């Protein structure tokens, strides 16, 4: 099991870390969400699906700098939301191809009242996403963290 993201950094067998760097939409109204859709930046597979199933849980998402200040935020982890800032482990996602399939995260982010101006900086960590991958094989227990670095200042009109 491995994953890698869209610009080909990848996270070996056995886990790691990298970075993610995400185009954000520049303006955002208060009552409006930025979606941060890292389904189309994360893929990950399975090395032996004759023999083995994969499981990959998001274990915990934290916020940073100004989502953790200016935003509001709900993480959906392949089709069910939840707290983000997360406050317990997900459910499983099962893998059991070698065939790439996107990790299925995306952050609904939503200005808090008080958010107004430049509520992101663009070069930011926004956040720190960990997948955590077990099997049906043995005891491998690994976690592949997930620095999410926003591209672009944010803008949240007053
Ligand atoms: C012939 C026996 C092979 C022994 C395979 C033991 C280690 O397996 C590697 C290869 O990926 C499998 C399937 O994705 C993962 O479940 C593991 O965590 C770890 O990444």
């Known amino acids: 099991f491995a994953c890698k993201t869209a610009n080909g950094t990848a996270i070996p067998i056995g886990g790691g870390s ?83 399939k996107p990790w299925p995260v995306a952050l609904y982010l939503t200005p808090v009242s008080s958010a107004g101006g430049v509520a992101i900086k663009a070069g930011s960590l926004i956040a720190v996403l960990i997948l955590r991958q077990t099997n049906n094989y043995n005891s491998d227990d690994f976690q592949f963290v997930w620095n999410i670095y926003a591209n672009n200042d944010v803008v949240v009109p007053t």
């Open 18 to 100: 990298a970075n993610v760097y995400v185009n954000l939409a520049p303006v955002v109204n208060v009552g409006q969400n930025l979606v941060v859709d890292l389904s189309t930046q994360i893929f990950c597979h399975n090395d032996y699906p004759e023999t083995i199933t994969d499981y990959v849980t998001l274990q915990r998402g934290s916020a940073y700098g100004g989502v953790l200040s200016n935003f509001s935020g709900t993480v959906k982890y392949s089709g069910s939301s939840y707290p983000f800032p997360t406050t317990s482990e997900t459910p499983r996602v099962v893998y059991n191809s070698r065939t790439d």
